[PDB]
Amino acid sequence: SVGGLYEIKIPTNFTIVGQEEFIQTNSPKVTIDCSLFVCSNYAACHDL
Amino acid sequence: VYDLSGFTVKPVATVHRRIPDLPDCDIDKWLNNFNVPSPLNWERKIFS
Ligand SMILES: *[C@@H]1O[C@H](CO)[C@@H](O)[C@H](O)[C@H]1NC(C)=O
Fold first, then answer.
1. Handedness of CA A46, B2, B8, B12 (dihedral sign)
2. Are B6 and A39 in contact (CB under 8 A)?
């Protein structure tokens, strides 16, 4: 401080800037038929 | 809402394909040959 005053940069002109932000709120609802995935249609696999 | 067990469309018919007119292997004629070799000189025949 000089004489109790400080040097500061104060804006003399301005613009508006736009910044986008994607926030994920959902995701693909994946479903699995465990029986069809593990064994297809083979009765020998479905029994086990 | 209930997702049921996955069904598969069942076969309407069957397809069977093989090379026609192939000769008999005659495996019995070679196995029944009376000139039987010993384990020391085991004989081999390839059937194709
Ligand atoms: C602010 O900036 C714009 C673009 O350079 C200019 O047209 C405008 O005259 C400026 N205003 C001042 C007060 O400097």
1. positive
2. no
- The tokens for A18 are 């736009």
- Alpha-carbon gap: B17 to the closest alpha carbon of chain A (Å): 23
Q: Which method resolved this structure?
A: cryo-EM
In A1-48, DSSP assigns E strands to none
Angle at CA of residue A21, ends A18 and A27, nearest 5°: 155
User: Which of A31, A33, A40 shows the shortest C-beta gap to B5?
Assistant: A33
Backbone angles phi, psi at A2, to 5 degrees: -120, 120
Is some CB atom of chain B closer than 8 A to the CB atom of A25?
no
- In angstroms, this model's resolution equals 2.4
